[PDB]
């Protein structure tokens, strides 16, 4: 998944004329293996039996990355690297 | 890593 939020600059009815932007990327991978042996038979005419044996492995791995920036003054020049430094820097996001 | 030893010719083609 790949998610993008934005807050636009040069807006009169807002508290700041500066814009913000945030970009996240999500990933999750699941793997599964199941192996199975079934034998069905009949001892007599009046008896049926079914035997089943099996193995199963389930695995999951998830991950989130995400980064934000602020201090924009135009709608065109709003990439994530064209923000203001200093006090407008934040720590990124990361979860596993 | 390390120190770079200079006088290379810049490759084009």
């Amino acid at each position: 998944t790949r998610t993008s939020s934005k807050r636009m600059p040069n807006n009169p009815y807002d508290s700041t004329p500066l814009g913000e932007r945030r970009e996240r990327a999500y990933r999750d991978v699941s793997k599964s293996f199941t192996n199975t042996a079934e034998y069905k038979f009949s001892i007599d005419e009046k008896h049926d039996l079914t035997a089943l044996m099996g193995h199963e492995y389930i695995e999951y791995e998830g991950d989130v990355i995400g980064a934000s920036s602020k201090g924009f003054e135009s709608d065109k020049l709003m990439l994530l690297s064209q923000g203001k430094t200093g006090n407008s820097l934040s720590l990124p996001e990361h979860r596993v | 890593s390390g120190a770079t030893t200079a006088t290379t010719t810049t490759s084009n083609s």
Partner: protein, 482 residues
């Protein structure tokens, strides 16, 4: 289908219609200037003088310039999307600064003539911005003429290039190829920009991070001294020498704490903005420094000669700041001027050796004023300023007789790259083969002869035009006979 795809993070070049657009392009001009006039580009003309000796750490990077290797120094440096360095990088960054200042100046002139600004304060600010751009055009043209044009005491040149300057563009177009101007045309253009810009900029300094009238006076005095006219140099340096006090320190650690910090240094006329995150850079060529935990360890590619160390008396404050005894942990001296600034640090405990750009300080205005006063025949002013500068620096001069001036100017401006211009202007030959190395550093700093002898009047004091020019327009006359 519409197939129109337009870039992200990029807008179009338009004429100026607002006042905030003029402010934005002016801030872009200053951030471009910070990556041009920084000390990393003036290391090449500093090593080429007779003060440095390459150590055994050198990987042929500084060895063309120190040992005068004219087979490499002809076509030297890169300027492309990977690297910008060398003589070709020095040419490219000042031509880029000149062209972008031209675009800013012509666009704000046309916006002033079309009456797009609202109030009168916007007109006054736009005229101040125009003068601040004229100063930067003057600086770019002067620094190209400094390296790529001959001083008048030259003997053998390529035929027709003794009274030539550089290619002079006065309006922005990137599709122009043409011949070189003369020296008189370029110098009247520089001095017209400076004299038109002094009459508009205000009397007192607005900010230390922007061009003022003090910087225009200081630059005009520097150009007039390097031209050879001492009366106008003294007359321009007298207007700025008494507004900036020297560093008042009592020992070497106090001088180190006040000198190295840009924010508290009380004698900076002009400097670039620097933070820990925006505007800082490491200049570790002349000292070779590397952080290690909490301290610094040095591995220099070139160390000074013994006659350079013997200029400083033992009680001088600059003999532990400007040059330091830190080679092989205690054994020898290196040039430690651009070490670090403790404000631009990630963690306050651990060094990262980041500095900022400084464009002018008042301790060069003193030296311009003393040299011009000595040459125009004025003895009390030269003493009045040389005793003051050398007593504020730690060890006072006894007699003022233009040997003390040469020694003090060599002591004060080390690392800034003014010695090659001085030894051209003073008729000093090289004598790199005659000097001895530092005796404590043997095994590390040894004797390498010059690969080309450089007497007085050698052509190779001025650089050769880079080989993208002389290839794209063949009406460019080159400098060197070879």
């Amino acid at each position: 289908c519409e197939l129109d795809r337009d870039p992200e993070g990029k807008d179009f070049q338009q004429p100026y219609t607002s006042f905030v657009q003029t402010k934005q392009n002016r801030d872009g001009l200053y951030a471009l200037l910070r990556n041009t006039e920084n000390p990393r580009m003036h290391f090449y003309q500093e090593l080429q003088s007779d003060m440095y000796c390459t150590t055994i750490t050198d990987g042929n990077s500084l060895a063309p310039f120190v040992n005068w290797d004219l087979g490499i120094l002809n076509d030297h440096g890169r300027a492309d999307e990977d690297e910008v360095s060398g003589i070709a990088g020095y040419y490219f960054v000042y031509n880029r600064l000149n062209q972008q200042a031209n675009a800013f100046v012509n666009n704000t002139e046309a916006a002033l003539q079309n009456q797009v600004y609202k109030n009168s304060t916007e007109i006054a600010n736009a005229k101040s911005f125009l003068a601040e751009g004229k100063v930067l055009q003057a600086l770019a043209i002067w620094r190209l003429m400094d390296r790529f044009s001959f001083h008048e005491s030259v003997t053998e040149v390529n035929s027709g290039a003794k009274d030539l300057g550089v290619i002079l563009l006065k309006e922005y177009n990137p599709g122009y190829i043409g011949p070189r101007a003369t020296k008189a045309q370029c110098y009247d253009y520089i001095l017209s920009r400076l004299s038109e810009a002094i009459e508009v900029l205000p009397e007192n300094r607005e900010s230390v991070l922007y061009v003022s009238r003090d910087y225009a006076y200081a630059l005009r005095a520097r150009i007039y001294l390097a031209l050879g006219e001492y009366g106008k140099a003294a007359a321009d340096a007298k207007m700025v020498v008494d507004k900036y006090p020297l560093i008042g320190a009592a020992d070497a650690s106090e001088f180190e704490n006040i000198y190295r910090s840009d924010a508290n240094n009380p004698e900076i006329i002009f400097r670039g903005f620097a933070s820990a995150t925006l505007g800082s850079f490491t200049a570790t060529t002349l000292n070779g420094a590397a952080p290690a935990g909490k301290d610094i360890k040095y591995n220099p590619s070139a160390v000074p000669f013994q006659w350079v160390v013997d200029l400083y008396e033992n009680e001088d404050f600059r003999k532990s700041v400007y040059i330091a005894k830190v080679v092989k942990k205690d054994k020898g001296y290196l040039v430690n001027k651009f070490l670090e600034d403790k404000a631009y640090r990630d963690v306050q405990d651990k060094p990262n050796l980041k500095v900022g750009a400084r464009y002018f300080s008042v301790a060069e205005v003193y030296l311009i004023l003393v040299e011009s006063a000595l040459q125009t025949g004025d003895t009390p002013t030269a003493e009045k300023y040389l005793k003051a500068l050398s007593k504020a620096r730690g060890a006072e001069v006894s007699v003022v007789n233009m040997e003390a001036l040469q020694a003090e100017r060599t002591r004060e401006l080390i690392g800034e790259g003014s010695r090659l211009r001085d030894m051209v202007r003073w008729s000093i030959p090289n004598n790199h083969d005659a000097f001895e190395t530092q005796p404590g550093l043997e095994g590390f700093a040894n004797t390498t002869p010059l690969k080309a002898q450089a007497p007085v009047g050698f052509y190779a004091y001025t650089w050769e035009f880079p080989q993208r020019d002389r290839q794209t327009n063949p009406q460019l006359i080159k400098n060197w006979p070879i």
